[PDB]
Amino acid sequence: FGMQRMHYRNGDPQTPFQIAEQQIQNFQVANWLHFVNNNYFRQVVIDGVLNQVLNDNIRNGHVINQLMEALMQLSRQQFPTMPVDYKRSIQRGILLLSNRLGQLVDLTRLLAYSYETLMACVTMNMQHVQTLTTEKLQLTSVTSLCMLIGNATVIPSPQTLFHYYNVNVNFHSNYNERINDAVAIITAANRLNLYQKKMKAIVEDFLKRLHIFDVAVAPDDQMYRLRDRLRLLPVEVRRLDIFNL
Amino acid sequence: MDVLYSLSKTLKDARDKIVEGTLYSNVSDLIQQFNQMIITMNGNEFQTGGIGNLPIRNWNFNFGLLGTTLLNLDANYVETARNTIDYFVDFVDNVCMDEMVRESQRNGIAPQSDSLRKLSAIKFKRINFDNSSEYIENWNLQNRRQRTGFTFHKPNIFPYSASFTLNRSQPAHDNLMGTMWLNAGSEIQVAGFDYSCAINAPANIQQFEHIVPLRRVLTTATITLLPDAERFSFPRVINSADGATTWFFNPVILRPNNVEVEFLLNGQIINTYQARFGTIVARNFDTIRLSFQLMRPPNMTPAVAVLFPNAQPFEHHATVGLTLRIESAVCESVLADASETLLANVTSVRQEYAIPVGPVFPPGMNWTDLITNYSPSREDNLQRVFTVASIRSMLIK
Amino acid sequence: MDVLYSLSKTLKDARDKIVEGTLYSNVSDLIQQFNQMIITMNGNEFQTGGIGNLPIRNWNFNFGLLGTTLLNLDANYVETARNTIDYFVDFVDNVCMDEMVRESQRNGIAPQSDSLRKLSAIKFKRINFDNSSEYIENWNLQNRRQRTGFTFHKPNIFPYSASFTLNRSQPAHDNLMGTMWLNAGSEIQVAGFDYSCAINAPANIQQFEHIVPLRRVLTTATITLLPDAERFSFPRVINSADGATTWFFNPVILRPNNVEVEFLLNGQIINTYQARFGTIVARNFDTIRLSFQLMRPPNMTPAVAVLFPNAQPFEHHATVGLTLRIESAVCESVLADASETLLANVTSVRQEYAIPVGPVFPPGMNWTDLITNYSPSREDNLQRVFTVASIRSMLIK
Amino acid sequence: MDVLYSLSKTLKDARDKIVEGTLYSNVSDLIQQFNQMIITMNGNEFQTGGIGNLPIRNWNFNFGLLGTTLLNLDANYVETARNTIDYFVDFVDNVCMDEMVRESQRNGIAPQSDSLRKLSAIKFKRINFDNSSEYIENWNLQNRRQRTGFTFHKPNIFPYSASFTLNRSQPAHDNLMGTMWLNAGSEIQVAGFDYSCAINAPANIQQFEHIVPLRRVLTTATITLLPDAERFSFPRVINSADGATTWFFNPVILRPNNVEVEFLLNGQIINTYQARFGTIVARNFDTIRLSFQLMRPPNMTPAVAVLFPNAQPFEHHATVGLTLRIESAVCESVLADASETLLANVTSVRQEYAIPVGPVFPPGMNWTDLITNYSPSREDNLQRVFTVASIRSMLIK
Amino acid sequence: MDVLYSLSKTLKDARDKIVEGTLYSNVSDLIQQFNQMIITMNGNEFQTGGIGNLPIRNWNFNFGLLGTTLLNLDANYVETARNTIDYFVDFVDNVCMDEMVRESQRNGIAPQSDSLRKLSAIKFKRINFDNSSEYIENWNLQNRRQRTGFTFHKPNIFPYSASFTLNRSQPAHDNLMGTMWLNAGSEIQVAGFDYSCAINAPANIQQFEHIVPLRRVLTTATITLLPDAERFSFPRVINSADGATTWFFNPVILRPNNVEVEFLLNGQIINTYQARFGTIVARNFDTIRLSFQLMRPPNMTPAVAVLFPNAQPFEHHATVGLTLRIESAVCESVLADASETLLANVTSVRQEYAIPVGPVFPPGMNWTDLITNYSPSREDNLQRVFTVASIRSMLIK
Ligand SMILES: [Zn+2]
């Protein structure tokens, strides 16, 4: 569009696309940028479980049409002052993805459907946090997916869905039962006045029996936070009644 | 008719919903319907007019489908859509007018214009959309031979009738007993007068009755009843019944005695109200019977005693009355009311394009004559033209 | 304006469609539109009020969207949505009031409030939804410079005016001739009186005419015409033209003969009705001419003869009359009528918040003065405030 | 109409810029526009004329694009260009005349000639160019329903009216009080006269008022006010109001005192000027109220005293006059004025081709009648024909 | 000022050239100018108003450049351009009004409003475009010290002044000799009168002189000089010099004798015309000297001889006169005139927003007072406000 390159300042509350959306006067590109900027997960509670839901436009794959409108506009854009061969390469690369409109709509709605179907089998709340360590995603791999996705619909098999659901349910129930064991033991120790009792041992056993944690690595402040939060939970009824006996 | 309504509905929704900036999800279904309409109409040719001064216009349809690949509609999309919508609205308006300006004694409910005849074909049934409007709903019900109902605010149900009946009379018109009345639109104002003030009447009571039959059965009607005919309570000079002479009416208003309003259906009393004024309800009826009495007051102060002597020279004339107004009602057949503009639309189109008087409707669509002789063929033609008028008003403000 | 209407309609549809238990397929597109509204409005600061007693309020937006994969909406969904709906309803209420309380001698159609000026930006166009209401439809059509129309039941087209014109008179006011009239809202009651009862008039006929020029061109109007001015049928004591004294009017009502009503447009007779009472139609007119007569009865019974002498002392004064009511009509300019509450809403907001009288409207939105001097600038401002009033009424009871 | 204006603009630019010797950089964009016009107009068949004596003309376009291979245009290039420019100018001229000689009561603003109707199509939108002239700019603003403004030098806002009003009179016409005026074009000239010189008037002051209601609202008007009416300051013989006889007026001119000039809008005084002559400004008005007084001079030398006796035989008649001239103003609608030639052009075309009297404009484009009854339909048609005349005046000398 | 004019010119060219369908080659350079304007104005905040009733408004600029590539502009491009154009037009309107309603005794030329003071910064110089209009041309020329020039039609150079001088007088005013003139706008009307018709004057000649200075030097002025003063050729009753009494003037017009009109610059006769009427040219002058003579006709017919006696009683008073109108002229300083609306615009804005009387201009921008005491500071402020008014009128109707 002939605009001067953006001098983006890190830590800006707005993202580069959020700036470009209000700095660009072309309707196709600006509308695509607006959708991208305000495209986030929507939180919904379904059957008592928090879910991260997608925008219906991407669930049905319609936003790919706006993406291709923007890409076509860019492809027929003038690109002032850019060397001509590089400009042609860029705009033919744009057309490479633009001419895959139907395939990319199919890819988007396939991805959305498989995400929905596999998310129906999640039992714990899908809490969204920025993790310490991130999974690396290769834009080359994304390109390969976009340029090689075909015409065959692949969906989870019913046995695969039931297996995923059983694994999630087993992990969730084990988590709750180990919480109950830890809370019962901690409460019993405090009620019997075992002052020479290290609740760090109980928390270590809890994390160990969760089976996904390398307990030797958990930081110390987090171990003590876990102890503090376990000390505050009410005891389960059966365990408490046995303790009362 | 249903196809014409669907064209109007689709165009109206196109104008209302295909607006710059709106999400395509708001108009996805509307665009599907619009493209279906374009596909169905493309390649067909129509002719409208040729009657009176209505110009003969030829219509051809070759339009591209509206785009479907867009997240939010923009200026180009709306301009492209409006270019097609304007032509379609013009065509629908001409079809509606050409249908309204035509009538037939037999088969009056069938399409009369060549364009609507053509749209009656099966190839066009794909454009049907949703028949939600009241008039199209009743059109479909009448086509299926079901019960229909139109809701009217002040239905124009009473043929205009301003008259009087003299039960006691003489050439001099100085000792008269009788009734006056005006029935117009939804108001019946009736008065009963006695010049003697029932001096010689049995029990000093004069009975008055007034029967108003309606050409259609009204149901679920709310009526205001008041105890005075305000229109017949001032001095009047009235032409005699045969027009030979004129007589004088100097009323003095007394309260109506033993008021009774009966709403009857096929001669059976359905509702009866005695000495109740204000808002009343008639659930089902085709005739109204208002009965009241002039009772000479038994006790009178000197002024009233002076007013009412017991001898011939009656200078004041005792008068009682009732005023009845149908504020709202429901009727199976289409009537004219004080809130809808369908009668006005039909009459205006006919007058503007100077349509020669046909065989069904009266000259100038005179509603008085229409309701006075609301025969079944007139009912069919009137329902057709009113439905077309509503379809047109859907698009033309 | 379209954006404000879209905000209000989105909130109305949120209140209606989004209910516990409903299928998500019933409300998916509305949920998308609601989320689009939230996205567009988030991060914008608005200010409302600051004129008269209308409080200054600051509006900030940071809300969360709504889920889009449920099967049936539950109580949690509605509870989460209702908070945002309440805040946005309050915002739209205040924006509409701020726009209604403002005028402009020039650029009457343009937004006048700061909030609406901000909403007129292009980033907000993504909230446009659909413009279905009559007022928003006419707003869009007028902006595009297309034929428009508002439908009014009993349009408030005649500024209040009760007066009398004397064509024969003298200081004693004992032998008069002329007309009385009341024009009010949608009704014209005119009476023509002659004290001599056309004793010496040529052919014993006295002609009366009454011309009412409307301030706006009404079209497709249905009228009711009755042969009596009941408002001028009783004895009166009336101040003279200059207020110097009073005169006595003692009417005796005769029928008006040779009644003819002409509805004219720019001096050309569009409709003309001769001796036709009841429901009539006028398709296009800006002037109503009434022409009636008082014919002295050629034959009289003794009472009538006694009350109509040929010498000077005229105890009873012959009177004829016409009552003409416009039940419904169509106007390209916005008017007040008996069914809509837009004038009431604008007046109520201005009165409640003690808005200073501006350079356009009369104080207190006095309809008599406004319709008397209904200039183009006033038409623009009135249409703007009425459109805002209807937008607000979509949400506020 | 924007397309017709763009055709005229590009042809004018070609005539004024495609000159022998001019660099090609001075006509690069113009040649691109000209070739765009040729491409768009190639293969389209138009027809003009048929009304009155305007000949029927058929127009075909099969031209070749102008060359672009010359550094400086030479004689051959200019001749080749002129060959096609002449034909295009002739087509535009005939389209403009055919559009000027037509009118329509309904939708008078819409194109009336077949050629302009066809040019209104979408395919011709490519020939749009720049809309910089005042009339086309106002046309576009009015279509968008934005502000419109025309600046007039001596606007012809007052219909011709030369008359007099007598407030005191008798058959002998020897003791008259009243006011005589001439409103014409942009000048009001009024004079209040009294034959008795306020000998018996209260406080020896006689009041005179003159209200001139304009048919359109003027703004930012520069006006000149002068304290005498030269037109009513010489002896004359005037016909009576009824024309039965003639009466003698022998003015002696005094200074008007308590001069007040009110420029009112909707009956509200917008500007007021008391005892101030020369250049004044009226920012927004639609009525002019001129109030002045004849004050009997309290002190008079014998020569003055002899003029005004206290008895009947008044030989000299005291007169006081005002003269108001609108030098410049701004109006939203179109008016004839002293500098513009549009009214002359339209009238000239109609007279030359003997266009029969249509249903909108008065015969012979009589401006007095047009501005006397300047109805909205006449305003639309007049704006249309004036815009077309301006478009034609940039091609035809 | 130059930057403000550049903004206005850019916006006007954007509104006139950026239209749907136009070739992008027709607007390439204009679009580059538009983008330069947006880039320069982005990130700057402005405030206007705060004087009188002009509302305080704050302006921010965050608009993006126009960069879409196409051959012909479409609806999307026009809409995106129009949003920014609307906002900038509003900003320019308010800045122009804020500058127009302000004054300064010292440094009148310099910007007064804070918005214009900011725009006078160097960082805004990147929006200059072309300064073509007459007023901005003269502004730049004055800044460069080159000679300016404003061409006026009927310049308003004479302050209104109606007066008389009595060179010979008596308390009875029976026998008067003197002059009587009205200078207003562009017209001088002078008349010498002698009641004795120069019976005893030397050579039977009376000489009258009239010297009219000008507050500014006019150049290349075309003037019409006619031999009679219409205004002073009628019977008059005129209050005396001290206002104590009134005297009678009963003129009989004779041809002015030995007419000599001289246009002088610094007391040196620059132009002179003796006994020549019609159109004359004064190339450069600051005062006008009109000399004329009343010569007693050496030969008289009996009627004339009776008209002019040698005794005292003088019933008819010999009068000669001249009229001189400046049709067009050129001045180095700004002036009002009959063809421009700048004075009207400034006065209208000040009146509308109730701007308190400032230290420079007289109350209500009274042109008579302005041109009477046309001080250097007043000239500076007047030129500033007139230039701003021209810039504003480039965008506002
Ligand atoms: Zn002039």
Residues β-bridged to residue B274: B260
Three-state DSSP class for residue C47: strand
Task: State how far the Cα of C80 lies from the Cα of B78, in Å rounded to an integer.
Answer: 35
For E82, nearest residue in chain C (alpha carbons): C122
Q: Shortest Cα distance from C265 to chain D (angstroms)?
A: 10
E224's CB contacts (< 8 A; 6+ apart) are: E278, E279, E280, E323, E324, E325, E327
Give the CA count within 13 Å in the CB-facing half-sphere of D28: 11
Dihedral pair phi/psi, residue C332, rounded to 5°: -75, -25
**Which three-class secondary structure string do you get for D328-390?**
EEEECCCCCCCCCCHHHHHHHHHHHHCCCCCCCCCHHHCHHHHHHCCCHHHHHHHHHHHHHHH
C-beta separation of B256 from B292 below 8 A = yes
* B74 near E CB under 8 A: yes
How far apart (Å, rounded) are the C-alpha atoms in residues A76 and A69?
11
CB atoms within 10 A of CB B36: 17
Put simply, the answer to whether B69 touches A68 (Cβ < 8 Å) is yes
- Residues of chain C neighbouring E79 (CB-CB closer than 8 A): 122
DSSP state of C186: T
What residue has token string 């705060």? E50
Return the CA Rg of chain A: 26
- Closest-CA distance, A149 to chain C, in angstroms, reads 25
Which residues make Cβ contacts (< 8 Å) with residue A137, sequence separation at least 6? Answer: none
Touching partners of C (3+ C-beta pairs < 8 Å): A, B, D, E
B336 backbone dihedrals φ, ψ, rounded to 5°: -95, 140
CB atoms within 10 A of CB B247: 24
Cα of C15 to ligand 1 centre, how many Å? 65
Q: State the residue for tokens 């002239």.
A: D133
Output the six-digit token pair for C203. Answer: 């052919």
On chain A, the residues whose CB falls within 8 A of the CB of B71 are 31-32, 35, 57, 62-63, 65-66, 69
Chains E and C: 3 or more CB pairs within 8 Å of each other: yes
Work out whether the CA dihedral E290, E293, E294, E298 comes out positive or negative. negative
Q: Tell whether E341 lies on the interface with D, counting CB pairs under 8 A.
A: yes
* B160-167 contacts, C-beta under 8 A, 24 or more apart: B160/B184, B160/B368, B160/C277, B160/C278, B162/C227, B162/C277, B164/B238, B164/B241, B166/B241
Binary contact (A57, B75; C-beta < 8 A): no
**C to D CB pairs, distance under 8 Å:** 29
- Nearest-angstrom CA–CA distance, D161 and D180: 10
Please list every residue in chain C whose beta carbon sits closer than 8 Å to the beta carbon of residue D373: 266-267
Closest to D109 in 3D by CA, of D384, D359, D385: D384
Of B15, B184, B397, the CB nearest to C278: B184
> C83 has which bridge partners?
none
Residue count (chain B): 397
Cα(C199)–Cα(C116) distance, integer angstroms:
68
**Cross-chain residue pair E76–B78, CB shorter than 8 Å:** no
- Compare CB distances from D145 to C106, C109, C377 and report the shortest one's residue: C109
Question: Does residue E330 contact residue E200 with C-beta atoms inside 8 Å?
Answer: no
**Measuring CA to CA, which residue among C137, C155, C148 is closest to residue C282?**
C155
Find the length of chain E. Answer: 397
Chain D contact for C397, CB < 8 A?
no
Burial of E54 (0-12, 13-18, 19+ CB in 10 A): buried
CB A29 within 8 A of CB C53: no
Resolution in A: 2.7
Rounded to a whole number of angstroms, the distance from the CA of D339 to the nearest CA of chain C is 27
- The pair of structure tokens assigned to B45 is 């040719």
- Report the DSSP beta bridge partners of residue E44: none
* CA-based nearest distance E85→chain A, Å: 13
Buried b (16+ CB within 10 A) or exposed e, E170-189: eeebbebbbbbbbbbbbbbb
How far apart, in Å, do the first and last CA atoms of chain A sit? 79
CA distance C345 to C357: 17
> Torsion-angle region of residue D225: left (phi > 0), alpha (psi -120 to 50) or beta?
beta
| Alpha-carbon span E12 to E64, nearest angstrom | 19
Say if the Cβ atoms of C67 and A54 lie within 8 Å: no
> Rounded to an integer, what distance in angstroms lies between the CA atom of residue C261 and that of residue D216?
30
What Å distances lie between residue C333 and C137, C149, C329, C384, E131, CA to CA? 13, 7, 12, 11, 44
DSSP alpha helices (H): ranges in chain A? Answer: 16-23, 27-37, 56-59, 63-75, 84-98, 101-119, 139-148, 158-192, 199-210, 220-231, 237-244
CB E32, CB E10: distance < 8 Å: no
Residue B388 Rama label (left phi>0; alpha psi -120 to 50; beta): alpha
Q: After which residues is chain D broken (C to N over 2.5 A)?
A: none
- C376 chain-D contacts, CB cut-off 8 A: 217, 332
User: Which of A31, A68, A101 lies nearest to residue B72, judging by beta carbons?
Assistant: A31
Which residue in B336, B365, B331 sits closest to B138, CA to CA? B331
A140: three-class secondary structure by DSSP: helix
DSSP, collapsed to helix, strand or coil, labels residue C95 as: helix
Q: Is C145 on the interface with D (CB under 8 A)?
A: yes
Secondary structure letter of residue A175 according to DSSP: H
Provide the CB-side half-sphere exposure for C194 (13 A, CA): 22
Q: How crowded is the C-beta side of D278, counted as CA atoms within 13 Å?
A: 26
Dihedral over Cα of A192, A193, A197, A199: its sign:
positive
Chains that touch D (3 or more CB pairs under 8 A): C, E
User: Residue B212 in contact with residue B183, Cβ under 8 Å?
Assistant: yes
Instruction: Find the helix or strand (DSSP H, E) in which B383 lies.
Output: helix B376-393
* Nearest-CB residue to C70 (from A38, A44, A54): A44
3-class SS of residue A245: coil
How far apart CA C109 and CA C124 sit, in angstroms, is: 19
CA distance D109 to chain E (A): 21
Question: Would you give the distance in Å from CA A176 to the centre of its chain?
Answer: 23
Q: Is E338 on the interface with D (CB under 8 A)?
A: yes
**E65-87 b/e (C-beta count within 10 Å ≥ 16 → b):** bbbbeeebbbbbbbbbbbbbbbb
Number of other residues whose CB lies within 10 A of the CB of residue D306: 12
Amino acid C78 reads: V
Handedness of CA E309, E312, E313, E317 (dihedral sign): positive
The reply to whether A73 touches chain C by the CB within 8 Å rule is no
**Whole-angstrom distance, CA of residue D373 vs CA of residue C265:** 12
Q: Is the sign of the CA dihedral C325, C330, C336, C339 positive or negative?
A: positive
SS (H, E, C) chain E: CHHHHHHHHHHHHHHHHCCCCCEHHHCHHHHHHHHHHHHHHCCCEEEECCCCCCCCEEEECCCCECCCCCCECCHHHHHHHHHHHHHHHHHHHHHHHHHHCCCCCCCCCCCCCHHHHHHCCHHHCCCCCCCCCHHHHHHHHHHCCCCCCEEEECECCEEEEEEEEEEECCCCCCCCEEEEEEEEECEEEEEEEECCCCCCCHHHEEEEEEEEEEEEEEEEEEEEEECCCCCCCCCEEEECCCCCCEEEECEEECCCEEEEEEEEECCEEEEEEECCCEEEEEEEEEEEEEEEEEECCCCCCHHHHHHCCCCCCCCCEEEEEEEEEEEEEEECCCCCECCCCHHHHHHHHHHHCCCCCCCCCCHHHCHHHHHHCCCHHHHHHHHHHHHHHHHHHCCCC
Distance CA D252, CA B169 (A): 77
SS (H, E, C) C262-330: EEEECCEEEEEEECCCEEEEEEEEEEEEEEEEEECCCCCCHHHHHHCCCCCCCCCEEEEEEEEEEEEEE
CB D193 within 8 A of CB D248: no
Q: Does E43 touch chain A (CB under 8 A)?
A: no
Smallest Cβ–Cβ distance between C129 and the set B22, B347, B396 belongs to B22
Please state, in angstroms and rounded to a whole number, the distance separating the CA atoms of residues C225 and C212: 15
Helix axes A63-75, A27-37, angle to 10 degrees: 140
Q: How far apart are the first and last CA of chain C?
A: 20
Of B88, B397, E76, D122, whose CA–CA distance to C142 is shortest?
A: B397
Residue E260: HSE in the Cβ half-sphere, 13 Å Cα cutoff = 12
Contact call for residues C342 and C65 (beta carbons, < 8 A)? no
Contacts with C389 (C-beta within 8 Å, 6 or more apart), sequence order: C96, C100, C341, C342, C345, C346
Instruction: Tell me the technique behind this structure.
Output: cryo-EM
Please report the number of interchain residue pairs, chain B to chain C, with beta-carbon separation below 8 angstroms. Answer: 165
Q: Which residues pair with E193 in a beta bridge?
A: E178, E319
- Interchain contact, D147 vs C376, CB within 8 Å: no
Backbone angles phi, psi at C155, to 5 degrees: -60, 140
Query: Tokens standing for A128?
Result: 């969204």
- Compute how many other C-beta atoms are within 10 angstroms of the C-beta atom of residue B291: 18
Pairing of strands B278-295, C46-48: unpaired
Q: What pairs with residue E158 in β-bridges?
A: E185
> From CA C383, how far away is CA C360, in angstroms rounded?
13
Residue D13: which of D1, D31, D25, D39 has the closest Cα?
Answer: D31
